[PDB]
Nucleic acid binder design. Structure first.
Length: 73
DNA sequence: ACTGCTTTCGCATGAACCTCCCAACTACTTTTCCTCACACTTGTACTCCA
């Protein structure tokens, strides 16, 4: 609950370095094809979101998977 | 004097206790595991007042 699945991933990418050995590349195209069909919206929002993504993004691709072995906070 | 008062004795073989523990199911602890949002600063935003 409430990022307990997420904070362990943050503790997992940090303790064992999934970063800098593997590819921490979240294929966001394979994620939002679901979210179109979850609530049955027209497929323009698949690309309407994409340019909102590609406007506000450091390094256009690759929403970064995060690593944390730093502390428990 | 004499009673009561004893004392051995028996047709032959076959055979014919009790308290505490371990019960049964209740309840009220143990044995260390994981999972984090909380205190003061500080840096960065968009105001300020001289």
């Amino acid at each position: 609950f409430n990022g307990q699945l997420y904070n362990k991933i943050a503790l997992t990418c940090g303790m064992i370095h999934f970063k800098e050995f593997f590819n921490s590349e979240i294929s966001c195209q394979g994620l939002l094809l679901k979210l179109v069909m979850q609530c049955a919206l027209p497929p323009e929002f698949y690309f309407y979101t994409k340019q909102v993504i590609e406007f506000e993004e450091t390094d256009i691709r690759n929403l970064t998977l995060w690593e944390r072995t730093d502390e428990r906070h």
